Amino acid sequence: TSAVQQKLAALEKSSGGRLGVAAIDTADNTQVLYRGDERFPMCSTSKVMAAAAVLKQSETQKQLLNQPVEIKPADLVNYNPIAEKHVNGTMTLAELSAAALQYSDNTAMNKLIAQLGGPGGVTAFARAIGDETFRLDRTEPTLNTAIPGDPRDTTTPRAMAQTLRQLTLGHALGETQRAQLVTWLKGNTTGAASIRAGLPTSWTAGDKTGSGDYGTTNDIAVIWPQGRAPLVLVTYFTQPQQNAESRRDVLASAARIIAEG
Numbered sequence: 510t511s512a513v514q515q516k517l518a519a520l521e522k523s524s525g526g527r528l529g530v531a532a533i534d535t536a537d538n539t540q541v542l543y544r545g546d547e548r549f550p551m552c553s554t555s556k557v558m559a560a561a562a563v564l565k566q567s568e569t570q571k572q573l574l575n576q577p578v579e580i581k582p583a584d585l586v587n588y589n590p591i592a593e594k595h596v597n598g599t600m601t602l603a604e605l606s607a608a609a610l611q612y613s614d615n616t617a618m619n620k621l622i623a624q625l626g627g628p629g630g631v632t633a634f635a636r637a638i639g640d641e642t643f644r645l646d647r648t649e650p651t652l653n654t655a656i657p658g659d660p661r662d663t664t665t666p667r668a669m670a671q672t673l674r675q676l677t678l679g680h681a682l683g684e685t686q687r688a689q690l691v692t693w694l695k696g697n698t699t700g701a702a703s704i705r706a707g708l709p710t711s712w713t714a715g716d717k718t719g720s721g722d723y724g725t726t727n728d729i730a731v732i733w734p735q736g737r738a739p740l741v742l743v744t745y746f747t748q749p750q751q752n753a754e755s756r757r758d759v760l761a762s763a764a765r766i767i768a769e770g
């Protein structure tokens with residue numbers, strides 16, 4: 510066990526839950542893993558794969574992001590901070606991608622899934638970029654059940670870290686699309702208490718959070734330190750009690766341990 514792994518194991522022990530971490534240092538492609546091959550519920554971190562899949566489509570469909578999409582009453586689910594502002598109006602796929610990514614809007618996610626022809630369309634994009642691990646099975650809000658041992662709507666930290674790297678730094682997308690995704694992640698509003706809270710303040714980051722039942726608390730990020738090659742960090746966390754509170758502090762502390770090690 511490495512010194513970082515010992516600190517992560519100690520953090521996990523202190524927490525009562527199950528922690529998964531994958532970090533990639535793009536300098537020497539060094540990676541640090543903790544439970545890196547275990548499945549975790551993705552919850553809203555799956556919105557990155559759905560938005561990226563739509564971005565991939567827009568590479569050949571040049572007008573796709575400006576395409577208006579109707580928001581109807583029946584579309585509303587459990588958490589719709591942006592979509593509920595536009596009921597009986599429209600939102601563009603760009604606006605829906607932004608809402609999904611920067612506000613974790615679940616109605617917006619469902620519109621991306623529908624654009625892609627169902628959850629199978631999101632999973633197919635994962636496979637098309639070499640991710641054999643990601644699986645999206647359900648729409649919002651049922652994808653957040655986060656039931657212990659259920660493989661539905663899960664991935665591993667190792668897989669999501671590699672995917673996130675390919676999407677935001679490594680040309681799985683076109684350049685206009687990659688920059689748009691980087692811009693979206695940087696502008697996230699839901700991440701201040703998660704990975705970002707554990708990083709040196711001179712570092713810049715983009716991220717996508719997730720949360721669900723079993724106190725599931727997740728964050729995935731791409732990170733730019735100054736005069737150092739960028740990093741990719743995934744932190745997944747879930748707990749034994751179905752009704753457990755969120756533990757964003759665990760993700761912040763994991764990021765601190767990675768940043769230092």
Ligand SMILES: [K+]
Pocket residue numbers: 609610611612613697698699700716717718
């Ligand atoms: K978010």
Ligand SMILES: [K+]
Pocket residue numbers: 553588612613614615
């Ligand atoms: K959400």
Ligand SMILES: [K+]
Pocket residue numbers: 755
């Ligand atoms: K909460």
